[PDB]
Amino acid sequence: ASVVDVLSFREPIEPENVVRNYDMKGPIIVFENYVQITPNGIGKSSIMNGKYKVDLPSFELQLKLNIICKEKCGGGMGVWLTEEKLKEGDLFGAYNIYKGIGIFINFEDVDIPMISVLKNDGVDILKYKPEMYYQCSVANIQKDKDGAVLRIKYLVNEKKLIIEIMVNHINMDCITIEDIDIPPFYLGISATNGGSGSTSYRVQSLHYYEVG
Numbered sequence: 001a002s003v004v005d006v007l008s009f010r011e012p013i014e015p016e017n018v019v020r021n022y023d024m025k026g027p028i029i030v031f032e033n034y035v036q037i038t039p040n041g042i043g044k045s046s047i048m049n050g051k052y053k054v055d056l057p058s059f060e061l062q063l064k065l066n067i068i069c070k071e072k073c074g075g076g077m078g079v080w081l082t083e084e085k086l087k088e089g090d091l092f093g094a095y096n097i098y099k100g101i102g103i104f105i106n107f108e109d110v111d112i113p114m115i116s117v118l119k120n121d122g123v124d125i126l127k128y129k130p131e132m133y134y135q136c137s138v139a140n141i142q143k144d145k146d147g148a149v150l151r152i153k154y155l156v157n158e159k160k161l162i163i164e165i166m167v168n169h170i171n172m173d174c175i176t177i178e179d180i181d182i183p184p185f186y187l188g189i190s191a192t193n194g195g196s197g198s199t200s201y202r203v204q205s206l207h208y209y210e211v212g
Contacts, residue, residue, distance in 0.1 A: 006052040007061070007187050007208040009035070023049040025088065034066045037077070037191040037201040045075075045093035045192035046201075049085040055184040058211040061152040063189070064204040065105075067142035073113075074196025076106035079152065080188035093190035096126045100185055103152060103163060105141060108194040113141045115150075115163060115174050136174040140167050147204050153211065154182055
């Protein structure tokens with residue numbers, strides 16, 4: 001019954017727990033209270049790559065956000081479930097060709113942040129049609145002073161992926177995808193500041209839970 005968890009880092013953050021499960025590429029920094037993905041600075045981006053590919057039963061991932069923006073936030077964040085570890089690129093810090101699922105929170109060029117899901121089958125999805133594309137809009141993601149929580153739920157038997165986001169104590173619907181397959185994957189986190197020089201992306205915690 002006891003499971004070897006190679007994804008989670010919980011509060012308080014213990015640096016060796018993060019390092020033993022994730023590669024770091026870009027200005028990632030483990031602080032006492034959070035993992036910095038990007039510091040302030042236009043165009044900066046980072047990828048945090050799970051070292052160990054996982055074969056999970058029905059699961060729920062909870063990514064608690066700590067995003068700082070002096071004014072309007074630029075760029076966005078991605079959570080990635082991919083066949084291989086992320087490479088760097090222009091798609092919220094990662095490469096535009098990949099096999100798997102990207103879950104994106106985008107602040108650049110919109111009034112209210114958008115959440116998107118982009119399933120890719122190994123093609124250049126900036127030039128060609130993605131295999132699946134879904135989106136929603138949720139207000140106050142970074143304005144929640146306690147830290148919004150991005151919720152990623154997958155039921156293996158139902159082949160159902162559900163994205164929710166908890167903002168200001170309220171669990172908000174966002175995306176449901178039926179008949180979507182998730183093979184064994186590496187878990188990645190990435191972010192770009194885009195056009196903003198006063199935006200900083202940081203993560204308070206990541207919990208993996210087996211769904212009953």
